[PDB]
Amino acid sequence: NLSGTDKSVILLMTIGEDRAAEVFKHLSTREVQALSTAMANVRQISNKQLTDVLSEFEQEAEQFAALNINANEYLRSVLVKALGEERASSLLEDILETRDTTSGIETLNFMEPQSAADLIRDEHPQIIATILVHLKRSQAADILALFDERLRHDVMLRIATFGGVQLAELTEVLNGLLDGQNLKRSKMGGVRTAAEIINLMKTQQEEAVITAVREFDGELAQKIIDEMFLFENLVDVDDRSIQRLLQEVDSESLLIALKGAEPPLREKFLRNMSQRAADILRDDLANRGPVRLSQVENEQKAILLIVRRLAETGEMVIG
Amino acid sequence: NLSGTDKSVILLMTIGEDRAAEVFKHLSTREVQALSTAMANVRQISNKQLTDVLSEFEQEAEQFAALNINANEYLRSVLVKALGEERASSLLEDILETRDTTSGIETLNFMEPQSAADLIRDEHPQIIATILVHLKRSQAADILALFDERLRHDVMLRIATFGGVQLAELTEVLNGLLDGQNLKRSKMGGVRTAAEIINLMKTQQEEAVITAVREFDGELAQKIIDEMFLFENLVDVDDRSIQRLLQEVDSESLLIALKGAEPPLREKFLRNMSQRAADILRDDLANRGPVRLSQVENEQKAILLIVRRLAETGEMVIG
Amino acid sequence: KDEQLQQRRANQRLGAEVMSQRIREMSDNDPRVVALVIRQWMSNDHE
Amino acid sequence: RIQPYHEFARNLPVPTNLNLIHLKPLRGTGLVVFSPSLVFIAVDNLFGGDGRFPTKVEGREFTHTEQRVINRMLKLALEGYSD
């Protein structure tokens, strides 16, 4: 694959540091280091490839660049020269911060409302008020709902008080918030991943760690057990969903997993069978005894894997 | 045979130290010493062979190398030059450690979970937590199951506490773990090999050493006796497996080994005969007396050898 | 493999063309440095 | 604390790590000690872990990573005391 980002990357690794420095100063740290690694280790070089890269650069120069004067590269310096020639007020610099602020406001709208809230909860309530006013109404309502009641009411009250609509101080406020997400994204919290990791573990060790974390913190252990939970009760799992998964899942696999599963689980899973399938499954459960628990757990894990596959499809909310 | 590793080895032993030094500095110690031995003792030289080697090198140069600038060989130095030109922070070196760390994490996933655990049990429980989080979920569950209950619960609790997602300290932690498996692989533990060696010994000396190790440590002696055990009880050996082996094994050999074997062994082996074969074997056992114990032991050893052959095939779990 | 040798000679000619293309890229970096910076910004935006 | 060397050794929490730091030009070598709990807490803070479920190691020698973290904290203490 060669995306528009990747085409520019190939251009850079082909041309050299003379334009790479300008690209870096107009670029971001991770892509700078990616091109540095590309320079350190390169195996995408070919006699035709390099010429095609030059042709693609010429296309960018005649289209994306349109053979124009430096775009905000040397122009910003002449803009600063005009600013210096005019009153001693760096409005252009304030506009630069506003540009990042407006882009950050759009990013804030894109990114998760609760993460935005907890990144702004520590900040000033007036900061929260003005940023919520300047944000999209839908994103603002999402963050409002994700706020606690008292903080939310204070934010709306200070929104009502907010009339100063200030002017360059607002831009640097957003810049500080962006810098508090500018740091490496991380997001390795994996609130689901503990649960996911324990599910990936063996079932007996899963139960042992569940008991251990119940001793550690009933709250955290209960959250982990909830993350273990996958189609255990019909009302939360949704019958239509039990209907859709289990026709995709092999009937024999469901049977083997059910005869090792609890009778409530058997009943709630068979309630979404075609009646012939439910009767056949129950009759075979009566016929054959509990097969090896290893095979029963294998069928249960296959059921969970198909649940995860349909979660990947995203047509309905699993449990 | 001439594998891709072997083709490069032939290339190196053909070209010389000028590129061999770079290959060594980009390579590993065992292959460095292998090429040193190849230089010390070489008998793969031919007028056509050397020219074909040069052609293969030219192919690698035009394809694998694609006539590109030094890949992370001289590039890393220019990357360090840029790093020196930029802020005084060796992020590139940290990324280098991260590269080994990520490769080590993948290796950790490949290699044995219990060996990984005992290599990480001595380390910090927070180290175990963060490495388990960063590893694959399946490998993490395997190591979790192979942990003891208390250590496993502590690891999951510290996984829950793990939110720092740190940043270059994590890389060197994996580097230390890799260095604790970087040492010669060894793995000459042969938990099975003692048992295997005693089985390779004579049966009377086998029993004598079994008694001796029972005196030494009933636990270790019992483990050795278990390693001796090979299809002695039907339930663990599995009837389907007794069915499959003994139709492959010669019926007369089974008969000779059985008339020197215990009646429970005879019954459990004949329970997987075709009824005609079982009746014929029992009738011949009644007819002929116990033949020489040497021949009986030879037939028993042939039975064990066929068991080992099917273990090599790996279609089912022997005992 | 005379045809393969001819293809290798063509590849060497292509390599000379690639060096000329690299020189043309160097010339684009050299003349109109402003335009080079503008194209840098444009490629970054397209990225 | 001023005490005899035997009294100091008796009061010393075994197991622990003892370090020899010479003080030129004065004859003899100085001594600095740190607790296993302290090194555990410092190293998990290096890992960023909370450490609210700690483990206590007794008799077991420090691993290579633990001794190396000991090395950095030792040199940091040496520099601080030097200045």
Curated annotation (Swiss-Prot), chains A, B:
A motif (Part of the EHPQR-motif) lies at residues 123-126. Keywords: Bacterial flagellum, Cell inner membrane, Cell membrane, Chemotaxis, Flagellar rotation, Membrane. Gene3D superfamilies: 1.10.220.30. It is a peripheral membrane protein. Pfam families: FliG_C (PF01706), FliG_M (PF14841), FliG_N (PF14842). SUPFAM superfamilies: FliG. The record marks R158 as: Part of the EHPQR-motif. It is found in: Cell inner membrane; Bacterial flagellum basal body. The keyword Cell membrane applies. GO terms for cellular component: bacterial-type flagellum basal body; plasma membrane. The keyword Cell inner membrane applies. GO terms for biological process: bacterial-type flagellum-dependent cell motility; chemotaxis. GO terms for molecular function: cytoskeletal motor activity. InterPro entries: Flg_Motor_Flig, Flg_Motor_Flig_C, FliG_a-hlx, FliG_M, FliG_N. Belongs to the FliG family. FliG is one of three proteins (FliG, FliN, FliM) that forms the rotor-mounted switch complex (C ring), located at the base of the basal body. This complex interacts with the CheY and CheZ chemotaxis proteins, in addition to contacting components of the motor that determine the direction of flagellar rotation. This is Flagellar motor switch protein FliG. It comes from Salmonella typhimurium (strain LT2 / SGSC1412 / ATCC 700720). The gene is fliG.
UniProtKB/Swiss-Prot annotation, chain C:
Induction: Inhibited in nutrient-poor medium. It is found in: Cell inner membrane; Bacterial flagellum basal body. It comes from the Bacteria. Belongs to the FliF family. The basal body constitutes a major portion of the flagellar organelle and consists of four rings (L,P,S, and M) mounted on a central rod. The M ring is integral to the inner membrane of the cell and may be connected to the flagellar rod via the S ring. The S (supramembrane ring) lies just distal to the M ring. The L and P rings lie in the outer membrane and the periplasmic space, respectively. The M ring may be actively involved in energy transduction. This is Flagellar M-ring protein. The chain holds residues 514 to 560 of 560 of the full protein.
Swiss-Prot record, chain D:
GO terms for cellular component: bacterial-type flagellum basal body; plasma membrane. It is found in: Cell inner membrane; Bacterial flagellum basal body. The keyword Cell membrane applies. Disulfide bonds: none annotated. Keywords: Bacterial flagellum, Cell inner membrane, Cell membrane, Chemotaxis, Flagellar rotation, Membrane. GO terms for biological process: bacterial-type flagellum-dependent swarming motility; positive chemotaxis. One of its GO terms (molecular function) is cytoskeletal motor activity. Changing L76D: Altered motor bias with clockwise rotation, partially suppresses a yhjH disruption. Belongs to the FliM family. FliM is one of three proteins (FliG, FliN, FliM) that forms the rotor-mounted switch complex (C ring), located at the base of the basal body. This complex interacts with the CheY and CheZ chemotaxis proteins, in addition to contacting components of the motor that determine the direction of flagellar rotation. This is Flagellar motor switch protein FliM. It comes from Salmonella typhimurium (strain LT2 / SGSC1412 / ATCC 700720). The chain holds residues 85 to 167 of 334 of the full protein.
